[PDB]
Symmetry: C2
Subunit: 377 residues, 2 copies
């Protein structure tokens, strides 16, 4: 057997265009976070690395406002942490109620069915949110093991209020499972106060990091549920029975953690802890309000009712007579700015402007706006 060199490409060292990433994700990581990746690795079970993990756990507890012991990073993107909440919480035949008001609601429906759930849904138009009474009626009707909601719907620009939801779930014996991929770091979240039982996020948005070290947490109620499973978790890579032994004191090998991505996450969290949560939320809200003003200035309208608008993701209506995809391509190629287009019920009807983490700054809006104006001429 001789070596086949047909796909032996002769490449030059990496060169990539510069992009201001103002879409649904990923965002531009902070420069110090990128530098932290360029550090020699140590072993995934080296006491220094374990010390670093301990630091990531503490800082994730701070940033999410939880004291859950099982608060870790998953070695995968937001979808992996998402799937881990489903795999660890759902046993075949469990009734799982999903509030669907956007693309990620539908993804939750798909995932839950793959773990054998009896899937129930309630729906709102994309950009709208569920009331307490709507949720109560759905809990009455479906009597589910789990209620899943997306806190910050990246596909619609809406923030789902969660006050009273945990208490409501406790009345029905239901676990509360919440997507905070687009809220963590940029929108106030109080997981414990809200009685959330499983939550997940990502590293590439409010946290100002590269994708792939995705926050995950489980409450005591959620662990109790995991503990009574009749079968093993049907996902080996995401089985919290095993991951809990690596992140816990047993320090049992499960997988070789992505050393350099954890370096980056620890540095990203350090930067958030330095700024301070309150300040971070304030920055994101101030920046989004400037965005809304500049957009109004140039005659563009907003999709989502003011009260529920995400500071991290704004849906802007596409005017009649405007090709939304063409505008987005021209922004990318002529201006090096990424923005998102609409999906599903919002296909062709909105753009999606991300203002997250390191990109939540005035300079972002100041690049976007005159670029948008020139493209809309």
């Amino acid at each position: 057997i001789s070596i086949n060199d047909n796909q032996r490409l002769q490449l030059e060292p990496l060169e990539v265009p510069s992009r201001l990433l103002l879409g649904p994700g990923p965002s531009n990581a902070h420069p110090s976070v990128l530098q932290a990746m360029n550090v020699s690795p140590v072993g995934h079970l080296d006491p220094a690395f374990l010390a670093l993990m301990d630091e990531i756990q503490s800082l994730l507890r701070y940033v999410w406002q939880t004291e859950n012991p099982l608060t870790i990073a998953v070695s995968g993107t937001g979808t992996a942490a998402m799937e881990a909440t489903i795999a660890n919480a759902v046993e075949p035949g469990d009734v799982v109620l999903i509030g669907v008001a956007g693309y990620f609601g539908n993804r939750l429906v798909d995932m839950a069915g793959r773990y054998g759930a009896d899937v129930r849904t309630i729906s709102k138009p994309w950009g709208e949110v569920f009331s307490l009474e709507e949720l109560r009626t759905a809990l009455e009707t479906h009597r589910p093991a789990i209620l899943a909601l997306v806190h910050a719907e990246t596909s619609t620009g809406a923030r789902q209020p969660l006050e009273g939801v945990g208490e409501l779930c406790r009345e029905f014996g239901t676990l509360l499972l919440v997507d905070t991929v687009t809220s963590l770091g940029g929108v106030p979240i109080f997981l414990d106060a809200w009685g959330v039982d499983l939550a997940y996020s990502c590293s590439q948005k409010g946290l100002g990091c590269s994708p792939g070290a995705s926050p995950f947490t489980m409450s005591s109620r959620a662990i109790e549920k995991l503990q009574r499973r009749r079968t093993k978790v049907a996902n080996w890579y995401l089985d919290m029975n095993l991951l809990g032994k690596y992140w816990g004191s047993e320090r049992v090998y499960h997988h070789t953690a992505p050393i350099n991505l954890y370096y980056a996450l620890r540095e990203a969290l350090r930067l958030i802890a330095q700024e301070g949560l309150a300040n971070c939320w304030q920055r994101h809200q101030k920046n989004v309000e400037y965005l809304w003003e500049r957009l109004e200035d140039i005659g563009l309208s907003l999709h989502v009712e003011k009260e529920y608008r995400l500071p991290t993701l704004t849906t802007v209506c596409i005017p009649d007579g405007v090709d939304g995809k063409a505008v987005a391509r021209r922004l990318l190629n002529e201006h090096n700015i990424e923005v998102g287009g609409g999906l599903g019920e919002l296909a062709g009807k909105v753009w999606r402007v991300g203002l997250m983490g390191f990109n939540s700054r005035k300079e972002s809006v100041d690049q976007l706006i005159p670029a948008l104006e020139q493209v809309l001429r």
Copy 2:
């Protein structure tokens, strides 16, 4: 609700010890690969990033010696790519035969059962390998849908010969599924010539990269099997029906790829293509032979029969009267060298010396040997 700052750690910028990583994994990534992570991200669907992915696919085809279209990186460590082969190949009730001759054989048994397989095993003492006749007898007995083998058993130091195995599997209508986590880049592999149907590797060993961008491939026979599934793949993050649409021309969003880790993988593969496969295999074999000599020089013996010794992972016997764990701790703390200890049948009986990728160099052995001598005094 006021903000709780109890876990708001006040940290200084990242500082980690230097370590020569000569254990089972991860290895020290090459400096240019680490530098490539420190580059601003672009979007996961930006044509420049898609171009980069196209490059990763071509170079993975070269390095693995396959022409499979579905050859990609999985956004997870070796365990994720491992699990993806199982999730995409196994339907409930499928008979799955695993050749268990080490720790990763047992992990395959565990995974397969979680996807509903009817799991069958054959066993060899750790450090030994299966013959063609042993495999034939097992295929006769179990008539399995899938035969799974570990090419390079990191827990034992043995290389499983695969010549004739694909032809044997075709006689029985069986798919061949192979772990190449510890062989890819450092040990000759000819996937297509060997008739392998699913394979997986990792990015942190022979490829000289950071963990988390793990090679995965499926043959046409394996895709045919996937295509006749009666149910969805029971793993959303690893479902090749969906990942195939991101890595293929449809370019449909599945997950936000770990941009900076793919930068690193593309650069790692570029470096291997520059060196050339033959040269890379030759380097690893020359370096391991120097290792064996220096170890003999200092009176240490080898566990594995010469013919099956891995160039990338050597099991060295622990002499009577020597505390293997204590030696390993002293190497780490007094000498900044990581080596592995034994597990399972080899607990307390072997150390495991990795010589992989960037660490497959004379300087590695030259650090290790006098350190080992001083520690053994």
